[PDB]
Write a protein that binds this ligand. Structure first.
Ligand SMILES: [Zn+2]
Lengths: 102, 74, 124, 88, 245, 81, 52, 96, 62, 217
């Protein structure tokens, strides 16, 4: 139970989204549950890249499409990253993934 | 009223082009049936071409009918 | 409005061992999403009544102008010929199949969400 | 432990209290952001096309009005009626 | 007798004191637009800083970047104010966009103001809280300012380096003028050599110094060739230029 | 449960900027510069001189459900040259 | 099941879809029906603790 | 007590439940349901045009007659082809 | 029957107003909503494998 | 300042998603020679920046034209598209949009007797794109009005309930004509937007600023 809040909130949030998504989920409940994903989606519509996943399909870029999806949901690991970085800071060490040679 | 008389005669002679465009449109749709019979796996693509083809072919009818209007009600 | 899983954790840690199996259903019902119940049925909206009265005023104004027109009777019969097709579309169109075809038009509704799996986010 | 403060605005649970307001897009908020971010940088070709068609149709209205006024002028100069009255 | 009246009205009511006294209601708005219009006087911004100083911690992100850009243009550094602005950025870092953070980091780089927590929150916000193509819309001078900021403060964040290395390309460096491109390439190559991080997009930096080496001096060319050999060793091959075809 | 009652709570709502669309169409139809179809801009002395029925042309008032095509509701200006 | 959730959705309360059922378009699988039964059985958390 | 609730429920019961293809037992006369929908469409058109023509008549039609009258107005004021002559004939027919 | 309207410029401006309103409503009200749904589903479907492998590597529960 | 709430998976959202993805698929992006990665991602983003939004424009024109075309078939209503200025203003608007894009690509420079002949052949697209849709809408309404008069004449001069088979046949013909008008409304909206996409995709092509320097292995 050192990090069970972060894993269990990921499980619960995705279970609610997957349970309700194409059926009756409002947009407000989505933007409440995942505000940074909605922010990264709104950046694409704002910066005229609203067809970017269509462009990556037209260019045949499956690796870049995987990177696009993974970089949009990359904030789901940010609470764990900040928690482990603060743990390593209190222990006096450095966080491993932050370094180029880690 | 010889001008209006010639307007009726000219519009009636003006719509002869709809014959040629109808013969061409029937040729194109018969070839659409043929091309669906040859390769039905792409048939829903071919119908699209047919519609696009019909599109441009139809325009040659409407430039006929426009002249008819420009003969009749100008 | 705090994290509901944090409330689950606090409520489970706050119970005693004798009270746990009794209180699990209430801890489940406390941190469960709000699905707001149906309110009392009211009158129509201001915008709904504006839409219906504006549609009726447009229909009356257009029928009046169609009556004033030179070929008035064929105008009023064109209205019958169009209303016949609006009637027949209610009988012909397979609205369930049309609904699910439109659901297949969008990729968000064409497939299920393929996302987080259980074995990755498990916490033993 | 990993507290709730690490999850603050990153990751939320489904709402238990009430359904919130929908988060607006920046274009839904202001027309200035839509106009300067997407309407002018992306759709100025369409706006120039509409401007060209309104300018051109104003030119065509000017030509039609000039021809109509010319016909009216020679009609009143010839001494005849420019318009047919009709029967009521 | 109207000229003596307009001379009495012109020296007592329309003054700088009533200008900075009507500018107290929305002070990041007024300081931003007055600094853009050119009004960069020190004493007005001394008044402006103690105007914002209570209500900094509850400002919006647009008002924070407006106030920070305004104090960059006025060149007035208030340590308690920028501690408040840094605490605002560190408080709700998820709301800030990448362009706002690049303007804020440019102001914090003009002065030598940094904390470890502020640097981690800006890097977390650019990397995780923002779109991964937001460095592409940035402009390489802003990203080089951020790279030199993190290099000067010695804060090593390889995820942020992999994020802001995306913004360096032929496009963003081609948008710059020649002197500004030389300055940006020198700053980015120095920061990448400091961190020991050589991404696949460093070559678009290196190429921007080697397609046109007429503006570069001999010691700068030695620096660029040092980073070029280091990137050749890191990326695993030799550096060629591509022609038109 | 479900969010069905949440969406049944909100009534009918217009498209978001429909007032601007109706305002643009109405401002195109009323701000034309030219006078109303059928009417002619006459002088104020002529307008105050003539009665109502003489000022109304018969071509602008067609009969509602005319028994004969071309019936007009009013007969305007029997005094003419 | 997904079909039951579609039947409880607002779209099947609308006038042109009042008498329609989503099972008639795509019926649920045997795995989906047995998993809906299993999830209804495990909705009691004490039963889930005892079962596990 | 509400009017629009009863109107919605009544139109639902008329739209979905009330079916004159089975209530009148029209499956013996007609082949299928779609044939009934087509014939009810054309019957709606026929009844509508007859109600309009039947509604207001006798009148001089603006649509071109094919040289046929209603069999009671050979040359009164309904079959007149010239419109001003038909108008004055309508006037001397309305004075009666 | 007349082919030409009373003003061609008025009808052209009506078409421009209607199409520009459809453009603004599409870009502003419809396409943000469409892309919120579509890009949520598409981001999850594009990142399922990488996300689950990264979370499987981070998870110390096994 | 508060926006409305939207159900995810609504039928208008799904319909407009399919329509937008269609008109976006009409002009696909070109595959680069290099593999798409973080080195190539600003080149891809700038390629998307230089490409005109023909998906948004074609969806705009499709939605407005199918809305007016279907307005023509509602009772007490005529299509706005059957007006000359409306439909031909839309046509000249698409032609001028394609021309303004192509001129801006060539540095705002206007373009051996092949050049006036190709100029007339290109300039006739402005006439054809609007006159096709306008002529089709005008012809359908005009044909229905002429046909309706003949049908009205049959029960006006043969009794209201005295001639059943000929009135039934001519009303079958009229009803099939209105169904054809529904088909022509949908088809001419789709045709206008497809020809819009090809006319602007003639000028949508631009230069790909790829990598000028690389590590070879
Ligand atoms: Zn009509």
């Amino acid at each position: 139970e050192e990090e069970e809040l972060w894993l269990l909130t990921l499980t619960q949030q995705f279970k609610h989204i997957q349970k309700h998504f194409g059926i009756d989920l409002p947009h407000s409940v989505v933007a409440h549950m995942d505000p940074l994903l909605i922010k990264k989606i709104d950046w694409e519509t704002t910066n005229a890249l609203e067809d970017f996943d269509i462009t990556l399909d037209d260019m045949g870029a499956e690796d870049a499409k995987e990177q696009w999806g993974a970089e949009n949901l990359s904030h789901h690991f940010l609470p764990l990253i900040r928690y482990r970085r603060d743990l390593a800071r209190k222990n006096g060490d450095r966080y491993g993934p932050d370094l180029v040679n880690g | 009223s010889v001008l209006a008389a010639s307007k009726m005669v000219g519009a009636g002679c003006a719509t002869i082009a709809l014959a040629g465009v109808g013969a061409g449109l029937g040729v194109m749709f018969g070839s659409l049936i043929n091309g669906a019979a040859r390769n039905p796996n792409i048939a829903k693509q071919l119908v699209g071409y047919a519609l696009l083809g019909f599109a441009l072919t139809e325009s040659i009818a409407l430039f006929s009918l426009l002249v008819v209007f420009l003969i009749l009600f100008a | 409005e705090g994290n509901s899983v944090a409330g689950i954790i606090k409520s489970v840690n706050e119970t005693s061992g004798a009270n746990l199996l009794s209180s699990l259903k209430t801890i489940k019902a406390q941190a469960a999403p709000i699905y707001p119940a149906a309110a009392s049925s009211t009158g129509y909206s201001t915008q709904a009544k504006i839409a219906l009265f504006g549609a009726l005023s447009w229909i009356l104004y257009r029928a009046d102008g169609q009556s004033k027109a030179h070929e008035w009777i064929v105008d009023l019969n064109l209205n019958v010929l169009q209303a016949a097709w609006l009637i027949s579309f209610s009988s012909l169109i397979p609205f369930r199949a049309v609904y699910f075809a439109f659901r297949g038009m969008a990729p968000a509704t064409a497939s299920t969400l393929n996302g987080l799996k259980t074995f990755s986010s498990i916490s033993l | 432990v990993l507290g709730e403060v690490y999850l603050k605005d990153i990751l939320r649970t489904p709402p238990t209290g009430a359904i919130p307001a929908n988060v607006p897009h920046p274009f839904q908020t202001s027309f200035y952001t839509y106009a300067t971010k997407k309407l002018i940088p992306r759709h100025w070709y369409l706006l120039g096309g509409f401007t060209f068609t309104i300018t051109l149709y104003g030119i065509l209205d000017g030509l039609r009005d000039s021809g109509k006024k010319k016909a009216y002028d020679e009609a009143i100069h010839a001494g005849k009626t420019p318009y047919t009255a009709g029967g009521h | 007798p109207s000229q003596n009246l307009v001379s009495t009205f012109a020296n007592k009511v329309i003054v700088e004191e009533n200008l900075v006294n009507v500018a107290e209601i929305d002070v990041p708005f007024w300081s931003y637009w007055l600094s853009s219009a050119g009004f960069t006087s020190k004493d007005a911004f001394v008044k402006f800083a103690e105007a914002v100083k209570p209500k900094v911690a509850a400002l919006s992100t647009s008002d924070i970047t407006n106030l920070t850009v305004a104090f960059k243009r006025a060149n007035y550094y208030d340590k308690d104010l920028f501690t408040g602005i840094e605490a605002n950025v560190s408080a709700n870092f998820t709301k800030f966009e990448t362009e706002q953070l690049l303007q804020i980091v440019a102001t914090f780089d003009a002065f030598n103001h940094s904390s470890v927590a502020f640097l981690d929150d800006v890097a977390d916000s650019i990397t995780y809280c923002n779109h991964y193509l937001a460095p592409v819309r940035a402009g390489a001078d802003e990203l080089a300012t951020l790279l030199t900021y993190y290099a000067k403060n010695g804060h090593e964040r390889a995820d942020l380096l992999a994020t802001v290395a995306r913004g360096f390309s032929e496009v963003s460096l081609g948008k710059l003028s020649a002197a500004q491109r030389k300055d940006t390439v020198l700053s980015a190559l120095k920061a990448f050599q400091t961190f020991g991080f050589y991404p696949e997009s460093i070559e678009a930096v290196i190429g921007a110094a080697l397609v046109s080496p007429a503006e570069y001096s001999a010691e700068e060319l030695k620096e660029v060739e040092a980073v070029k050999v280091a990137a050749e060793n890191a990326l695993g091959g030799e550096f060629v230029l591509i022609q038109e075809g | 449960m479900s969010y069905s009652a949440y969406f049944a709570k909100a009534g009918f709502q217009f498209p978001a900027g429909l007032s601007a669309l109706v305002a643009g169409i109405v401002a195109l139809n009323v701000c034309t510069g030219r006078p109303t179809k059928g009417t002619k801009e006459i002088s104020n002395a002529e307008y105050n001189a003539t009665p109502i029925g003489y000022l109304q042309s018969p071509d602008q008032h067609p009969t509602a459900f005319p028994k004969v095509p071309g019936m007009k509701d009013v007969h305007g200006s029997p005094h003419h040259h | 099941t997904f079909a039951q959730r579609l039947n409880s959705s607002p779209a099947f309360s609308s006038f042109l879809l009042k008498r329609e059922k989503a099972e008639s378009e795509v019926p649920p699988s045997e795995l989906e029906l047995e998993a809906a039964q299993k999830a209804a059985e495990l909705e009691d958390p004490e039963v889930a603790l005892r079962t596990l | 007590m509400a009017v629009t609730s009863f109107l919605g429920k009544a139109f639902e019961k008329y739209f979905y439940d009330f079916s004159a293809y089975e209530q009148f037992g029209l499956n013996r006369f007609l082949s299928s349901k779609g044939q009934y929908v087509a014939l009810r469409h054309v019957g709606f058109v026929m009844v509508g045009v007859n109600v309009l023509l039947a509604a207001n008549f006798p009148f001089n039609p603006p649509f071109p007659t094919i040289g046929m009258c209603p069999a009671g107005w050979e040359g009164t004021w309904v079959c007149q082809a010239d419109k001003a002559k038909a108008l004055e004939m309508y006037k001397e027919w309305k004075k009666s | 029957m007349k082919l030409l309207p009373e003003s061609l410029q008025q009808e052209a401006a009506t078409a421009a107003v209607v199409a520009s309103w459809v453009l603004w409503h599409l870009d502003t009200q419809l396409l943000p909503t469409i892309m919120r749904e579509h890009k949520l589903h598409a981001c999850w479907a594009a990142a399922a494998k990488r996300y689950n492998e990264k979370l499987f590597k981070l998870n110390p529960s096994y | 300042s508060s926006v409305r709430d939207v159900k995810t998976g609504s039928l208008p959202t799904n319909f407009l998603t399919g329509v937008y993805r269609f008109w976006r698929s009409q002009n696909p992006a070109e595959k680069p020679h290099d593999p798409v990665n973080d080195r190539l991602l600003p080149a891809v983003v700038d390629a998307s920046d230089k490409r005109a939004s023909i998906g948004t424009w074609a969806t705009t024109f499709f939605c407005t034209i199918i809305s007016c075309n279907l307005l023509g078939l509602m009772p007490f209503n005529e299509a706005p598209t059957s007006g000359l200025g409306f439909a031909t203003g839309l046509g000249v608007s698409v032609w001028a949009t394609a021309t303004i894009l192509g001129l801006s690509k060539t540095g705002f420079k206007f373009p051996f007797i092949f050049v006036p002949l190709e100029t007339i052949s290109y300039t006739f697209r402005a006439v054809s794109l609007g006159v096709r849709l306008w002529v089709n809408m005008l012809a359908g309404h005009t044909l229905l009005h002429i046909l309706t008069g003949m049908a009205l004449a049959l029960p006006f001069s043969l009794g209201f309930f005295s001639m059943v088979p000929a009135t039934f046949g001519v009303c079958c013909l009229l009803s099939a004509l209105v169904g054809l008008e529904y088909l022509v409304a949908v088809l001419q909206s789709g045709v206008f937007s497809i020809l819009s996409t090809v006319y602007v995709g003639e000028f949508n092509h631009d230069k790909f600023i790829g990598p000028a320097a690389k590590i070879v292995k």
